[PDB]
């Protein structure tokens, strides 16, 4: 039930999504090991993901959370990078998309920094890099990130290195 709608670069919605991508790039403490060396991206395409069943599943849970947190879903827009982006856009997030060894336990992880989610596009730690060249810093191969609507509700604050 998923359809993908291309956004024009002239569309304000394309432009605001691109700006969030580009403006949340930072340097990483691995010197680019996982995600590559770069300060900015070449955006090739931005598509809106439209799936009624997945949307309704999201809004149902959002209302439950909201009602448990003084009518506040604490909804954010956050990046997610994964080898399974194609499964996610068709079937939704589930336990198969979790970072079992993540520092905050086995859950599904998102980042404010697009460059942080970029480190996971080819796997944990960048895996072996792109499938074609085995390069975590490949400048040729096309990468994909999701920019996601996320309900945080009441969020446990972990101060961490």
């Amino acid at each position: 039930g998923t359809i993908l709608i291309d956004l024009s670069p002239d569309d304000k919605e394309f432009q605001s999504v691109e700006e969030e991508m580009q403006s949340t790039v930072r340097e990483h403490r691995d010197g680019g090991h996982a995600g590559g060396i770069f300060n900015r991206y070449n955006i090739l395409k931005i598509q809106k993901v439209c799936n009624k069943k997945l949307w309704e599943r999201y809004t149902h849970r959002r209302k439950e959370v909201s009602e448990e947190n003084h009518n506040h879903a604490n909804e954010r827009m956050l990046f997610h990078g994964s080898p399974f982006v194609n499964a996610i856009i068709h079937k939704g997030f589930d336990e198969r998309h979790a970072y079992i060894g993540g520092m905050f336990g086995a859950g599904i992880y998102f980042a404010e920094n697009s460059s942080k989610s970029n480190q996971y596009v080819y796997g944990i730690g960048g895996g072996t890099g792109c499938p074609v060249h085995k390069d975590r810093s490949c400048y040729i191969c096309h990468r994909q990130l999701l920019f996601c609507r996320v309900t945080l509700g009441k969020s446990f604050l972990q101060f961490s290195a």
Binding site: N42, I43, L54, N69, H142, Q144, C148, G153, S155, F156
Partner: protein, 47 residues
């Protein structure tokens, strides 16, 4: 998947060393996120 800490719906990982890092977040139910935009890109080689 693990469970959220009791009384919570997510975890926020607040950076405590790297002054320039933004937050990272964890949810424990797939239904708490919707993949709204698919962004296809390349990283660019610095000049």
């Amino acid at each position: 998947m693990a469970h959220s800490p009791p009384g919570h719906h997510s975890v926020t990982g607040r950076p405590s060393v790297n002054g320039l890092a933004l937050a990272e977040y964890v949810i424990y139910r797939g239904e708490q996120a919707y993949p709204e935009y698919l962004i296809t890109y390349q990283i660019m080689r610095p000049e």
